[PDB]
Amino acid sequence: LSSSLKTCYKYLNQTSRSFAAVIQALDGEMRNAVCIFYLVLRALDTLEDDMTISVEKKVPLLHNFHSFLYQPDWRFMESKEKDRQVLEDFPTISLEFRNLAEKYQTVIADICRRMGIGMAEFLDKHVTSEQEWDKYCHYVAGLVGIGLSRLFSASEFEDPLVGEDTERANSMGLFLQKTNIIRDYLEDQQGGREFWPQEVWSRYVKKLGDFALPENIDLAVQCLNELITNALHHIPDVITYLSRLRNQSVFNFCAIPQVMAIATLAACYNNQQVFKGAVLIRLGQAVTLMMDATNMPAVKAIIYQYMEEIYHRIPDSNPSSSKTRQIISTIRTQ
Amino acid sequence: LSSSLKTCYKYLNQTSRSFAAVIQALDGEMRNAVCIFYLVLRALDTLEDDMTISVEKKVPLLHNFHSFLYQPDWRFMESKEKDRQVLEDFPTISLEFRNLAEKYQTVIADICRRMGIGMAEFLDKHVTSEQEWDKYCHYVAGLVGIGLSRLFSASEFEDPLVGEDTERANSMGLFLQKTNIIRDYLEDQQGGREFWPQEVWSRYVKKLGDFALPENIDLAVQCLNELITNALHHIPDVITYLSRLRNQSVFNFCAIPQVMAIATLAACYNNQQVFKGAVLIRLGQAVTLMMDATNMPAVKAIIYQYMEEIYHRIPDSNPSSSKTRQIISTIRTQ
Amino acid sequence: LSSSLKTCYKYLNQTSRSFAAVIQALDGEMRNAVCIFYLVLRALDTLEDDMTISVEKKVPLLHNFHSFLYQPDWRFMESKEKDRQVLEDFPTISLEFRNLAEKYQTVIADICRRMGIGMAEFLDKHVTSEQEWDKYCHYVAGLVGIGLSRLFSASEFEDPLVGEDTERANSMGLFLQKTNIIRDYLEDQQGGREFWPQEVWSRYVKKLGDFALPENIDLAVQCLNELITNALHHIPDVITYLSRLRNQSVFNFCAIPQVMAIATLAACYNNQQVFKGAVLIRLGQAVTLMMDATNMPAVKAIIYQYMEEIYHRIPDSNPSSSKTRQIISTIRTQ
Amino acid sequence: LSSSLKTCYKYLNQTSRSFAAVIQALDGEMRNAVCIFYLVLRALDTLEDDMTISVEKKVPLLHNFHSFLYQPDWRFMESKEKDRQVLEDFPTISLEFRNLAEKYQTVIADICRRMGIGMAEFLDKHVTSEQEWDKYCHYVAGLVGIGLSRLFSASEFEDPLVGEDTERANSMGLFLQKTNIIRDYLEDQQGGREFWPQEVWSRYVKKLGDFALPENIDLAVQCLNELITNALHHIPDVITYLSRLRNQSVFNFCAIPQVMAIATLAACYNNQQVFKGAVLIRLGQAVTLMMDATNMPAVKAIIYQYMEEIYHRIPDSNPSSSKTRQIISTIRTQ
Amino acid sequence: LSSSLKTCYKYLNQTSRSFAAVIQALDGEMRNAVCIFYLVLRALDTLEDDMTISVEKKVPLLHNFHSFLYQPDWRFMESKEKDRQVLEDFPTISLEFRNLAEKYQTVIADICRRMGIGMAEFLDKHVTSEQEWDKYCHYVAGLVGIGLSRLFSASEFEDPLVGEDTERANSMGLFLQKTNIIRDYLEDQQGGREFWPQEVWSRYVKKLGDFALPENIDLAVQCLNELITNALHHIPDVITYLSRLRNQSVFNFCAIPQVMAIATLAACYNNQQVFKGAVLIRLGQAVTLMMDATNMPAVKAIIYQYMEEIYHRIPDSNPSSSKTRQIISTIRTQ
Amino acid sequence: LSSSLKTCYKYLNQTSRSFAAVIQALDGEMRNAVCIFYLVLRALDTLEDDMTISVEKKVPLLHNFHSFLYQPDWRFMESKEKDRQVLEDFPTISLEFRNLAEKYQTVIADICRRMGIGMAEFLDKHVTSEQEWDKYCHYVAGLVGIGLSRLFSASEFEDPLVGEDTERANSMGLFLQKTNIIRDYLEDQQGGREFWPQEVWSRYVKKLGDFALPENIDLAVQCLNELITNALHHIPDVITYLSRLRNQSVFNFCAIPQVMAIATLAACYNNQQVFKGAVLIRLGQAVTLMMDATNMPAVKAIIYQYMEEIYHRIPDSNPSSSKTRQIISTIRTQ
Numbered sequence A, B, C, D, E, F: 001l002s003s004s005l006k007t008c009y010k011y012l013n014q015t016s017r018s019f020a021a022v023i024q025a026l027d028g029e030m031r032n033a034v035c036i037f038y039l040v041l042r043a044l045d046t047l048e049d050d051m052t053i054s055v056e057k058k059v060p061l062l063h064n065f066h067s068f069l070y071q072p073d074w075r076f077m078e079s080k081e082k083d084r085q086v087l088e089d090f091p092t093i094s095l096e097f098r099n100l101a102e103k104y105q106t107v108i109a110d111i112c113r114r115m116g117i118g119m120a121e122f123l124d125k126h127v128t129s130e131q132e133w134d135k136y137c138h139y140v141a142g143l144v145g146i147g148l149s150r151l152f153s154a155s156e157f158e159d160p161l162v163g164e165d166t167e168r169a170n171s172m173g174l175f176l177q178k179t180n181i182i183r184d185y186l187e188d189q190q191g192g193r194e195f196w197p198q199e200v201w202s203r204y205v206k207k208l209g210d211f212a213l214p215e216n217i218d219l220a221v222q223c224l225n226e227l228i229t230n231a232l233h234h235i236p237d238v239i240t241y242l243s244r245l246r247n248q249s250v251f252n253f254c255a256i257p258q259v260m261a262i263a264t265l266a267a268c269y270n271n272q273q274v275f276k277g278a279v280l281i282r283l284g285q286a287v288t289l290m291m292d293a294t295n296m297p298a299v300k301a302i303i304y305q306y307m308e309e310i311y312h313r314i315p316d317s318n319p320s321s322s323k324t325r326q327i328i329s330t331i332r333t334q
């Protein structure tokens, strides 16, 4: 019941409007491990996002972030971002980090190290090919899924096979990040950041920003549907990853965010609203409301319902119509 | 791998308004077995329903349908029903049927044979007695529950007792079938098919179509309550059946349809809209919304809530009022 | 089987709108045991409630109620309350009480005895201190939690610890009761009933009724918030209690009311609507929408989420602001 | 049940003294899949062994054997080997192969195609280098390990990783094959078959048959120990492979053979009786006789005790003594 | 620790040749329940066995044995059997029986009653048709299986489905009983007791005692193999019954005896020794003596192995050979 | 990987005839922790036993042994014992010890400290009372069980209760040490050492060494039986301890030696061989022959059968006859 740990859960709730609850619901040692992992990841992400920090100053910070975890007094006072508090009071967070069992520390520091290098690499450039999209998503989210999987296994609450399957753990992260990148197009435009793959949107317009102009709305939706179709390809891996889980607290923690991401894609599919503001992630059909997302068979059913939601709205004229039906067919059939 | 299996799942979603998701969520071997079972039954159902097929031409098709499963090139191209695609492209479906392990084919083929016999038997006669209504329901639904039960046991996902207790399995089908027949009175009136037992409505009117007349509305609702009261007698068997299930995916699959059926009966009870149009399923109490139908105790609770919802709505002036309380009381006291 | 037992379940459904279904869903012997316990408490409640019964007659009735359970012919025919049926036909209920395994009777009678004495003590007084608030809530709710817990442990469907930790079981009762009391301020005002602790509301207004006056709305809300903060202190115990349960039917029974209570407090916090009418229970958002209260990890998540709903609304000007943050912060870190 | 499948199990029992029982004990789908896989591999092996078949007829037979699985009428009547029954009645076996799920079919056919290629390649030569020894074992045993692993994963009874980690699957086969080869030195000599690596035995004598001549025993045993030391290098992979298994029926199936092999290498190590007759696989040690190979920890314990048994009888004078100690040191230290 | 209970365990060990250990290994309350259930059955059987008792005197005893359990001072002193101590000191046994939970007492008392009735029924008549052989075994062993099954369920260490499946529990018993009878032809000979079905042996010789004559050895062995073939038909039910079990202590208790029975039938098939004195229980193979009978897959492999020992030694010239192969084939393929 | 860690396991295998394999099969960090713990204990043991070390020089070594763990270059070169290279190359061991986590280091050092003190104490005296026999066993074995139990709990592979209940953990050690002391009477004697309690043997002979004399064989066996009977009293604690373990690798590690000790007692009971040569463990029985020692119920069964092996061999005239029967009865009854 330390004051520093108290402060960490206070920061967790300040920064994680929607993950805090499921994290705090994790069994035993996973609870603190994941909470701290989230805080350090949040601090690292804040550094990356801060555009008042020059690239030459930022690179060292991203590269060396993992080592600060072991520097009791290290902190950063120049952030202007909204979640700067975890940076300004990082010693409180790093202290609890050093309080975690060594097995968790090793995993957390390793992920931070690798993520730092990955974030620095993409600072100067924009994502070009879809292969580079996967790479960038791997760095900022896939590594998180891998790190979490190792924490689950290290804790013994999940089978060691969970932490060992880096491929599907990576896909878990890729699906959430691609979804968020899809949904946040407009929010990111006004932020001066570009995440949509250039080799994909350049086939529709000259400037990614063009998707924001009312006269390019049809071309925007086509590209939107193409990127969503791309993201849906990770669902098989997601289902496979979730099917392996055996601990209920872990299952809830992993399954819920994925289903919310799926609901989000279904809501954004062929939706002009994506380019005019926030998308109305609305209700589902009477089968989704007779079963929640806390057991695998139910999670599958919920996922399939969302898939038919997209399937039924696929325009024949859409350049990606066949591939969209294809991946959904694959998900349905398995 | 199989592009034909994908087509089958495509058909499953085109023909199943709400079962596709839970069927696709079934564990291992049961997934394909139930998908294909559903499809052949749909094709058979389509033949029965087609009124452009004279009775003389139709009987041999119903009788030999179970054998067509082994005729690679067999198909039917003269149907005008909306699900005619499963008949026209039946070879794709029967191919996947022949790919199922033989122990599943045996079960499916047997139900198809027995169902053909029964459907043919009822082509030239309406349903008269209540015992005849059970007879018909057994033929088109009861056997499906028995078939599914034998598949569950043969797959070893459920206890051998599940497939052996043909009575409880039959009841699962009877409950759903009667519920739909009750609900679709009006829709069947325009289609020109009568399912409500003659011995029951013949005491309220001279022509089953009379309930359509807004002047006999009160007489209609009375008959409605009597049949609903009839259906409620299957519930104790449904509870017994569901309480023996141990596989979560099977449980979700079996429970949800039963719960949806019960909600429907509650919505239709002493409801006049049944004869004027679409009956809107009304939400449940605060407790039911707190739980989904995925664990036995929760399913019991949801079922009891729907019972009490019908109970405090029983008019003393209803000729069945006494019988309704009786069965509902028997359901409550176990 | 017996007509008296069904009569009991008929009464349960008439007098127990909120617990009937979950009680009937309980495993084995707990079913009848809790059904009867609820019926006898219902009768006791009805007597205490009935204002046409003189204090002279009521005191002896409350003190000796537990003994009526042993007198085969005892009944009361002078109640003017809606649920009087349980008093007039008490013989039927007492008969079933005597048919319960002796161990269950020991618990029900002991609770009725102590509850009667507690209710009699509060006939000629309102609630003064917060200490008297706990005392009162223990008499009408805490003891119920303790009795139920002892029944669970007696049935062996739960471990002995459940029935042994009376403090935690008591806390389950206090949380629900304080929540209802906070919620029903206005209704209880239009009923001449006072439950808000005078030692608390007197620090805001001269009379409790004043809170119903528009010019006092601000003081009323401050008081509302202080009491709510008081209620939140029982949450650690609620969590400890629920986390020890192992039976699904018992878990559904215990968890749902708690979640609904937390939701209520979340919706009532800093809400002026409490003093103008009945407050609309806000809906859970994001994670809470994808999970039901049927497994412990999910319930924790639901609870933590509603806690943040309150935390996000705490205005710095509120006099209890710091205390509200503190207890919540404690709930999060445990 | 089908008569052909019953016939397949009849052949399984005829051709597999040991494996038959553990194969029949495999859960669900793996039962028939492994039974059929074993039989076709038996038929292929029977053709590869038949020396009466002119290589002008043999190579195409081994190369195309995989294609015969799809030819209903194919069979081979010109064999005099003892298991010629599976060749003469191949249609019965291939029929059942075509009855297995497609996902198993592709695995079996693919392995048979590749094994066929490899067997034909080694028909005109003996093993030269140790690298050719691994290649040879890969073709006749390694591929079987890889095939079964793909069947285990496809059945979902084992993790996706079991099927993917082909290196480990390969090692399972290499270890059993090398073991049998080392142990069957004489039987091969009194048969005209040369399997021991040439580049290895040549450094000891001029002709492999020389190890049979009593005056070369000192060199024979020396060569024996080198080969054994070579095989021990697979044990680390065997432990890793076995450690991933989670299905008891599969574990029994996979573990038992490995333990018997390891025990064999223990009995043959530095034992000149290998060149005189048949070696007697004694019994476990004080501890090995207290545990069976049905759980991973026990299997590890058993493996270690055998390793230590070899470590003890290691001559300081033996040329491979240093290596033999190194490999064992690595195995016992993880 | 009760001294009467200690005495009961002293008797259990005295009256139990091979199963006292596994009974004492049973978890929790099953421990004493089964120990006492075995002692009372022991007494009940010792009564029927005693010939110094008249038929008209024995009948009432057997009929009321179940009632003696509730008569503290009841005891039989005129018996001169091997285990007469359980009769002379029955009060000690009944006392402990009366200390068992009522749920266990009901089961045990019920079985004794039904058993007593059945036993008396065969006091004057022999075993004629196999139909009657099953009726007999059902009374003296079959019912014991049902009893044990209900105790497992009542204790809750095993799923209620275990006690529910009376048919496979009955088979468990018939298999052991038929086995022992087959094995004890000689002992039952020097006792004047005939158990082999009349219709079966009479069809070989006119005097069932003939088989004790060297001149009818071949006539004998034939009848032997025929009866053994008869018993083998129970293996599918034994396998199915054992497969349902989930408790380890229950599994060891149920499986060990079944395996020993199978090993006995194996040793007795086509064996003259059966008519010359007790038979030896030969060795098995490594792929079993490397795994105890403590996990279902291992039990299956062990069973399948014994099935082969029978099959390999079936004489073409035996009148039942085809049927023997038939049932073994069915066991192998299922 | 670690050269020093490999050398460590090399010594573990040289100095541990019966623990190396089960130790190397321990999960996660228990593997190295236990390895090191066993190595340091072996070193401490090698010092106590070396008689080339004057008592005045031994006490300091024993008392400060625990401190040598933190002295990188401490070692011993004057030992003449066989396991002496664990002291000469002790820094290698101390190095790995310091590589372990603190929680593990804390435990080992604590036990090494407490053990050194105890050993030092019995350097001049011999065991007099049975009470001193326990104390002695406590210092050389009981503490080992406690240390190991605390290591299991710290690693968290087992619950806290394992390390807390020092009593049961102590018994585990006493049963093993007493069993070894009983078994090794002779070589201990031919080595000039005395461990049998004088208050027990002095009732039989004038000098413990007299049991080596042929003429005292009968008296030696009587004493042997009295000591064995004493050891048997720890069996209840052994079963309790084992029945609380939850990790398979931990269970195997703990159960195998105990079952080995029990078998040893059963073989030494009333056996003159104990005073002449070596006692060959006459294996278990045919019921426990189908059971290994890797699951609790089987372990119980194996233990109960060995108890009966002893029970049936108890001589009526043996002075401890009653005591032996008494404790065996207690074990049967629980």
Ligand SMILES: CCCCCCCCCCCCCCC[n+]1ccn(CC(P(=O)([O-])O)P(=O)(O)O)c1
Residues within 6 Å of the ligand: A015, A016, A017, A018, A019, A020, A038, A041, A042, A045, A046, A140, A141, A142, A144, A145, A148, A149, A172, A173, A176, A177, A254, A257
């Ligand atoms: C086993 C499943 C694992 C899924 C892992 C998905 C990882 C997705 C990237 C997470 C990177 C760590 C957090 C970096 C800071 N960050 C940015 C956004 N967020 C999410 C927060 P938000 O943007 O909404 O303020 P919230 O939705 O949790 O409240 C957190």
